[PDB]
Design a protein around this ligand. Structure first.
Ligand SMILES: Nc1ncnc2c1ncn2[C@@H]1O[C@H](COP(=O)(O)OP(=O)(O)O)[C@@H](O)[C@H]1O
Ligand SMILES: [Zn+2]
Length: 513
């Protein structure tokens, strides 16, 4: 009721000292407290931990928490108990007499929370014992580890699928900081969360302004940006190679801005040197690769595209941990993107991994190539949905020049619907062009009314119109990289909504060498 909500608040105040719920917490709490399942996505420091702790206390019985991290579980228990919350940890390095003092406290219903290493949890009899205990809920922390594409991975987290089969009646909560569009499908498979609500909260950072542009002579381009907009300011400037980092630094010092290289082949010495000369003093600039601390950074500059949307989110987020406005500045070139693809084409990685890695690359480029608000594109990749344009990005503020492909979009959307939402971008494009592949013949797709219906255009165009549909969320990729129309597809199909491309991409043509 509202009498549940009131109840939770009096807990929020009296225990964690927090005044009010951040982002979607209060929904999650009331969702789980009432018996519901949940997927929770929040960035690090976002406030996950009490998403499960608060329901544990509101429901009769004990919240059961699983995380791979033992040392942090020990600390999270301690702090909980000093704050007046009855918590315990159980793992197999406890003396057997301790493991029983805790096991019996569970069964008597004496614990608000019990933190359990997956090692112990997965053991039947830890399983069986739980069925005899007054359990309020399960919380699978670091929930992403269930996924091979998951940031981290463990055999043991795949096995937590047991929780849903052995305890279907009881609420299950998964929380992870880092999830792409599907590592998430795996979380949802494994833990049987596919019908549960999904919550994302803290990903946005409203005080950072995002800008992307192409590269012609980037050093001057950067130098000019610092210059006008951040002369006495601290900033990070990111490059792929160790080589670029040191040129960029030598060069920036040659123009007498105070700049320093930072990277793994700096002797220890110099690393700590650069570190506090950057932290202590204001208006100093670090040139880093992928590598730490700083409160007030004004600008992050990317002289290269990162290898993922994740990396880019991380590095730009180093700006502005003051609520005070900051800018993220990036310049890329298609030249580069082509190199990344061939360097990943010639690799020795498995074909399953190349498809996924090229996936991340497309998402990254398409993010660059946005004809619509950049903050929506960025946030969508992590599952956050921003209703309206931010007014804080380079697309919002200085709208680029766009071409209207809304009718082409409809052809693409309808092609994939009518083909049963399972087929991939290369394949679909074969359809709208009219190409009869020996793989197009296998599905009889050539006999459909949507075949060659897009013949007016070429491959490069459909592939990009495809990329955009995915990126804006009009398309979703199921497997194995095959594409679904979404609930959002209707916007383009009822219309009222358009699919734009940057006039920037298209250009008078043809390319030449
Ligand atoms: N509802 C809230 N309102 C204000 N501050 C919060 C709120 N929830 C969490 N925080 C803060 O930010 C931190 C979140 O980190 P924690 O919840 O401890 O683990 P995680 O990094 O997984 O979220 C908290 O410890 C607390 O300092
Ligand atoms: Zn915007």
């Amino acid at each position: 009721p509202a009498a549940l909500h009131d109840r939770a608040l009096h807990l929020l105040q009296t225990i964690w000292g927090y005044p009010a719920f951040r982002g979607v917490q209060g929904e999650i709490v009331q969702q789980v407290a009432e018996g519901g399942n949940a997927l929770v996505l929040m960035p690090t420091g976002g406030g996950k931990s009490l998403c499960y702790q608060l329901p544990s206390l509101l429901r009769p019985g004990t919240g059961i928490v699983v995380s791979p991290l033992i040392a942090l579980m020990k600390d999270q228990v301690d702090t909980l108990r000093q704050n007046g919350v009855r918590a315990a940890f159980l793992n197999s390095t406890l003396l057997p007499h301790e493991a029983r003092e805790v096991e019996d406290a569970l069964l008597r219903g004496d614990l608000d929370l019990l933190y359990v290493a997956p090692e112990r949890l997965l053991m039947p009899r830890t399983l069986d014992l739980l069925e005899r205990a007054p359990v309020a809920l399960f919380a699978i922390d670091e929930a992403h580890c269930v996924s091979q594409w998951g940031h981290d991975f463990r055999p043991e987290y795949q096995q937590l699928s047991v929780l849903a089969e052995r305890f279907p009646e009881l609420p299950r909560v998964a929380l992870t900081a880092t999830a792409d569009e599907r590592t998430r499908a795996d979380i949802k498979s494994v833990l049987r969360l596919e019908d549960a609500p999904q919550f994302v909260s803290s990903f946005d950072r409203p005080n950072i302004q995002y800008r992307v542009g192409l590269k012609d002579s980037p050093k001057t381009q950067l130098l000019h940006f610092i210059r006008e907009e951040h002369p006495g300011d601290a900033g990070i400037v990111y490059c792929l190679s160790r080589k670029s980092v040191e040129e960029t630094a030598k060069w920036l010092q040659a123009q007498g801005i105070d700049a320093l290289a930072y990277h793994a082949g700096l002797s220890s010495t110099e690393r700590n040197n650069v570190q506090e000369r950057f932290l202590n003093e204001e208006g100093v600039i670090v040139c880093a690769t992928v590598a730490i601390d700083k409160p007030n950074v004004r600008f992050v500059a990317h002289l290269d595209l990162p290898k993922s949307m994740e990396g880019y989110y991380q590095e730009t987020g180093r700006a502005g941990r003051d609520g005070l406005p900051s800018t993220a500045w990036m310049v890329y070139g298609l030249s580069d993107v082509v190199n990344v693809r061939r360097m990943l084409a010639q690799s020795d990685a498995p074909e399953e991994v190349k498809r996924v890695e090229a996936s991340k690359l497309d998402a990254l480029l398409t993010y660059c190539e946005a004809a619509t608000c950049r903050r929506q594109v960025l946030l969508h990749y992590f599952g956050e949905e921003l209703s309206e344009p931010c007014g804080n990005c380079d697309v919002c503020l200085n709208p680029p020049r766009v071409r209207d492909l809304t009718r082409e979009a409809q052809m693409a959307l309808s092609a994939t619907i009518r083909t049963g939402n399972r087929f991939g971008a290369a394949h679909l494009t074969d359809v709208l062009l009219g190409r009869e592949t020996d793989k197009v013949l296998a599905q009889g797709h050539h006999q459909l009314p949507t075949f060659g219906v897009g013949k007016e255009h070429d491959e490069k165009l459909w592939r990009s119109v495809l990329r955009q549909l995915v990126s804006l969320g009009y398309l979703s990729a199921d497997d194995h990289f095959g594409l679904r129309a979404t609930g959002k597809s209707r916007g383009i199909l009822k219309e009222g909504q358009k699919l734009l491309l940057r006039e920037d991409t298209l250009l008078p043509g043809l390319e030449h060498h």
